[PDB]
């Protein structure tokens, strides 16, 4: 095992831990491609967690710098300020694949704002946040999971990304509330006459469930739309992307089964991930 492999293994390790779902799906891709996904995932994870758990903008600048460093000089050795392994893997990926640096930049700009947090007045802002945090990830991943990096492919990957993030938010209401963050908009929170702090105490109700379903409705609709357009992705990527998405979208049924709980992070047992893997691999 060469050292560069060591760095990719560290990226994988990170992905395995923070996302059993995506890890479960993407590891099915051929070597060169999953390596690229591990690295890109690790980068994003460091960004996200350098603020959603280690709330530290200093690091975030360390990472933002390393990347600009790579974009600027893909073929020079750098003494990265944040996490050498991940950057080395990313830099290695970039010397082979096209990378949308601006996309990592939008994510960064985005998780920054998650410092002095302020609710969203409208779903539009909610939706734009889904873009900066996920749509942009779909955009960085596009050159990796596709052959035709065209407007249509970027646009689908992006929507996939935004949809997967809406589901993400649909599961984490409680977790997010404990952390002092509500992502449903006030417009929509008022319209449905619901208070998160109040539901958190006395439990769900129908105001919440309806509201929760309003969003789920959206998420699922966009999910179906992207599945239709799944062929914009490579043949090998298609089933994996589908499993990644169905494995993630299944989370909605899990929030339901647990009665929209605000005190647990529901999940999809690895055995169901296997079941879904099954129902899809037939089709392929
Ligand atoms: O918006 P949130 O609630 O912080 C959400 C993370 C969003 C940022 C993020 C983190 C890690 C990976 C990621 O993008 C991916 C997703 C799949 C594969 C590779 C990268 C996006 S999390 O709930 O999983 O932490
Ligand atoms: Mg987070
Ligand atoms: Mg979340």
Swiss-Prot record:
One of its GO terms (biological process) is carotenoid biosynthetic process. Pathway: Carotenoid biosynthesis; staphyloxanthin biosynthesis; staphyloxanthin from farnesyl diphosphate: step 1/5. Binds 2 Mg(2+) ions per subunit. A third Mg(2+) ion binds between the 2 farnesyl diphosphate (FPP). Mg(2+) 1 binds at residues 48, 52. It catalyses: 2 (2E,6E)-farnesyl diphosphate = 15-cis-4,4'-diapophytoene + 2 diphosphate. Gene3D superfamilies: Farnesyl Diphosphate Synthase (1.10.600.10). GO terms for molecular function: geranylgeranyl diphosphate synthase activity; metal ion binding; squalene synthase [NAD(P)H] activity. (2E,6E)-farnesyl diphosphate 2 binds at residues 45, 165. SUPFAM superfamilies: Terpenoid synthases. Mg(2+) 2 binds at residues 168, 172. It is an enzyme of class 2 (transferase). Keywords: Carotenoid biosynthesis, Magnesium, Metal-binding, Transferase, Virulence. It comes from the Bacteria. The keyword Translocase does not apply. (2E,6E)-farnesyl diphosphate 1 binds at residues 18-21, 41, 45, 171, 248. Its cofactor is Mg(2+). Its EC number is 2.5.1.96. Belongs to the phytoene/squalene synthase family. CrtM subfamily. Involved in the biosynthesis of the yellow-orange carotenoid staphyloxanthin, which plays a role in the virulence via its protective function against oxidative stress. Catalyzes the head-to-head condensation of two molecules of farnesyl diphosphate (FPP) into the colorless C(30) carotenoid 4,4'-diapophytoene (dehydrosqualene). This is 4,4'-diapophytoene synthase.
């Amino acid at each position: 095992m060469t050292m560069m492999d060591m760095n990719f293994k560290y990226c994988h390790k990170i992905m395995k831990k923070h996302s059993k779902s995506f890890s479960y799906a993407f590891d099915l891709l051929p070597e060169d491609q999953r390596k690229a996904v591990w690295a890109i995932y690790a980068v994003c994870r460091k960004i996200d967690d350098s603020i959603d758990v280690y709330g530290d903008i200093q690091f975030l600048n360390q990472i933002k710098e390393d990347i600009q460093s790579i974009e600027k000089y893909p073929y020079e050795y750098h003494h990265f300020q944040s996490d050498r392994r991940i950057m080395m893997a990313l830099q290695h990926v970039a010397q082979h694949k096209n990378i949308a640096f601006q996309s990592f930049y939008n994510l960064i700009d985005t998780v920054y704002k998650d410092q002095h947090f302020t609710m969203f007045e409208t779903d539009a802002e909610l939706f734009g946040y889904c873009y900066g945090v996920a749509g942009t990830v779909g955009e960085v991943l596009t050159p990796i999971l596709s052959d035709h990096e065209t407007h249509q492919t970027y646009d689908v990957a992006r929507r996939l990304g935004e949809s997967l993030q809406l589901i993400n938010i649909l599961r984490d209401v409680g977790e997010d509330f404990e952390n002092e963050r509500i992502y449903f908009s006030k417009q929509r929170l008022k319209q449905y006459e619901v208070d998160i702090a109040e539901v958190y105490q006395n439990g769900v109700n129908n105001h919440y469930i309806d509201l929760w379903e309003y969003y789920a409705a959206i998420a699922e609709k966009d999910f179906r739309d992207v599945m239709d357009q799944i062929k914009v992705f490579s043949i090998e990527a298609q089933p994996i992307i589908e499993l990644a998405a169905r494995i993630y979208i299944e989370i909605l049924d899990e929030v339901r089964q647990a009665n929209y709980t605000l005190h647990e992070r529901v999940f999809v047992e690895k055995r169901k991930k296997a079941k879904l893997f099954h129902e899809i691999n037939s089709k392929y």
